[PDB]
Amino acid sequence: DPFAGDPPRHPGLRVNSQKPFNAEPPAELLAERFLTPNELFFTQNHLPVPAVEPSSYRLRVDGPGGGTLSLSLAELRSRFPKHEVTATLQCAGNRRSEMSRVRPVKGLPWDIGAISTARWGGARLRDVLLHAGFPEELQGEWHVCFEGLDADPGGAPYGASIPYGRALSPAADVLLAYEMNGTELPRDHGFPVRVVVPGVVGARSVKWLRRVAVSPDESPSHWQQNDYKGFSPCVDWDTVDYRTAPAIQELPVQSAVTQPRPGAAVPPGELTVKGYAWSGGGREVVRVDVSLDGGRTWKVARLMGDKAPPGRAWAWALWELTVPVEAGTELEIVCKAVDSSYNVQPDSVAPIWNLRGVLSTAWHRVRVSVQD
């Protein structure tokens, strides 16, 4: 059994796949803290988790001339000044289950928790590429490809890429992280090294990093070429052409209600509605609107989190609204967020449906009742 070596996990996780392991924190905890504890941080693994011996570990990074720099874990910690970045990882498949309610899709049935936040610490990718000899700017469209230590039966490793410009930008904060929420990277989250690409879909943050290579083309791996792309709602498995859409990089504006939960009965009087909101590309969320009546009237919720500099809002904003509720009434609780370029979330799922169930950002609707 190729999965016998996997780490043990926290017992309260909402597991949707045991092998390979994929799970999300329970929604009643998801937004309980700004930083998600390492043991509740959602996990997405495509393969068995690699067992890595710290000192024999080497990160291979290909130089501009065809040579190969070979860094050990200790050298990565001491050569480069440690940088810390608090960033939210949201999986492309977050909220896929709401899509399945319209028309079945292919994929892990995530609810609203394929997203978590953490303070990451490690080397700036930028610094590692400069040390390897690359210039700050290459002419044309270049990419930085990553490969993990985890590989399938037939030898292919999980892989992804980001544009060279993003890798080199001081502002973009791309890290080769070896620390998570102040402790070392847990095995499930990439020990000893992973890439963390703030503002960008989870798929690009390659875990258990074994190689970094600069290339004129995107990563040729299956997960970069033939997956994680958005299509028209009309497209199906026989008409789908992966060359007609760009690989998902930055994600659109997103939000969900974490309290209360669907079906709940809530005491009359006052109700505190809580949730998260986030946007890709470092775009700050500037407002969250909340509705108790299915989206015909709205009030502005209160935002917490900490103002990050412009174009660098890598972390979610948690929100709450305490509102008056009348005994024996029916509520349809809805939330929607607005980002700094004023992008908004769409009303319904059907018009954004796609065969892979990714990019599910329609309003989150929660139905509950007020106790008599």
Ligand X SMILES: Nc1nc2c(c(=O)[nH]1)N[C@H]1C(S)=C(S)[C@@H](COP(=O)(O)O)O[C@H]1N2
The footprint of a second copy on residues 284-323 (CB under 8 A) is: 286-287, 289, 295-300, 309-311
Partner residues linked to 276 by β-bridges = 256, 318
- Two tokens at 331? 């509520």
Q: Which is closer to Cl ion, CB of 93 or CB of 260?
A: 93
User: Do 92 and 359 contact (CB within 8 A), yes or no?
Assistant: yes
Q: According to the 3-state scheme, what is the secondary structure of 203-236? A: HHCCCCEEEEEEECCCCCCHHHHCCCCCCCCCCC
Answer whether the bond into residue 20 is a cis peptide, omega within 30°: yes
Q: 349-368: which residues touch a second copy (CB under 8 A)?
A: 350-352, 359, 361
Q: Judged by CB, which is closer to a second copy: 72, or 169? A: 169
Nearer to ligand X, 193 or 290 (CB): 193
Residue 340 interacting partner from Mo ion, Cl ion, a second copy, none (CB closer than 5 to 8 Å by kind): a second copy
Instruction: Return all residues near 261 (Cβ < 8 A) that are at least 6 apart.
Output: 27, 28, 366, 368
Contacts for 371 with CB less than 8 Å, ≥ 6 apart: 265, 266, 267, 268, 327, 328
Nearer to Cl ion, 108 or 138 (CB): 108
Residues lying near ligand X in the complex (CB under 6 A): 41-46, 89, 91, 148, 150, 158, 189, 202-203, 205-208
Tokens linked to 201: 């879909």
Three-state SS sequence of 311-342? CCCCCCEEEEEEEEECCCCEEEEEEEEEECCC
Longest dimension (CA), the chain: 74
Nearer of residues 24 and 339 to a second copy, judged by Cβ: 339
**Under rule CB under 8 A, how many of the chain's residues touch a second copy?**
46
On the 0-12 / 13-18 / 19+ scale of CB atoms within 10 A, 61 is buried
Least distance in Å: CB of 95 to Cl ion?
11
Q: How far is the CB of 203 from ligand X (least distance, A)?
A: 4
**From 176, 203, 257, 338, residue interacting with Mo ion (rule: CB under 5 A):** 203
Of 230 and 268, nearer to a second copy (C-beta) is 230
Give which of a second copy, Mo ion, Cl ion, none residue 203 binds (C-beta under 5 to 8 Å, depending on kind): Mo ion
Using CB under 8 A as the criterion, which residues of the chain lie in contact with a second copy when the complex forms? 141, 163, 165, 230, 232-235, 245-246, 248-253, 280-281, 286-287, 289, 295-300, 309-311, 336, 338, 340-348, 350-352, 359, 361
Using CB under 5 A as the criterion, which residues of the chain lie in contact with Mo ion when the complex forms? 44, 91-92, 202-203
